[PDB]
Amino acid sequence: IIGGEFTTIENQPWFAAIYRRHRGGSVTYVCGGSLISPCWVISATHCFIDYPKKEDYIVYLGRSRLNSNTQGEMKFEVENLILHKDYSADTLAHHNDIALLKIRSKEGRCAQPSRTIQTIALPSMYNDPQFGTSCEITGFGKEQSTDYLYPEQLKMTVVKLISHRECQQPHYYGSEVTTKMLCAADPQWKTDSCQGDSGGPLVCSLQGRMTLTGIVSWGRGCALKDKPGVYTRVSHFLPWIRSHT
């Protein structure tokens, strides 16, 4: 997250931190995710496509810091890693960029709700907030271009939804952005998601309820003028989510 604020997991209790264990035994942070039901985390296929071996991943819930323990945190393995069969990647754009992780503790248990672990609501079919709506993004991604390590503390920011018409302008993304994607940015280009925030939530109030509207997917640079963050439009993928869970 470029700009924004440091946060804590109690303020983002659906947030899942996804890591990968490497040959040799080191663990690195991969991407964010969102808990949509006790056994299911939703994320982005691009986070896993190059290393689609589920045994290598570790999922934490209730965790506020990248390399320190948070009281109440729960660690999970991935019982089932479901990537979208029609996923593809262009120079900038990622398509059908959505993934499901069925999570399981070593005891076989799913998430147990607490102060720091909660599910996030899915939207209804075809129902997104109007453009101009302020929404929140959360993650452990880069804070500036020169970062070579991800920040130790979880961050959040607030961005505004941008219409498809605006996002497809020639100096934005042209026809590279589709109606299965949502754009969002800071009107002054001062805050944005960035590398490492992928897979994490774009959360909006929709009929007074916190709703998973998007999944961080792609964008040129970070907080770059006329280059919005692009998010998988969760409301278009409900049939896929329903059939695969």
Partner: peptide, 13 residues
């Protein structure tokens, strides 16, 4: 190869 959102955990990052 590629940098930024979309490129995490890739060999071409």
């Amino acid at each position: 190869g590629x940098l930024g959102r979309g490129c995490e955990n890739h060999r071409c990052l």
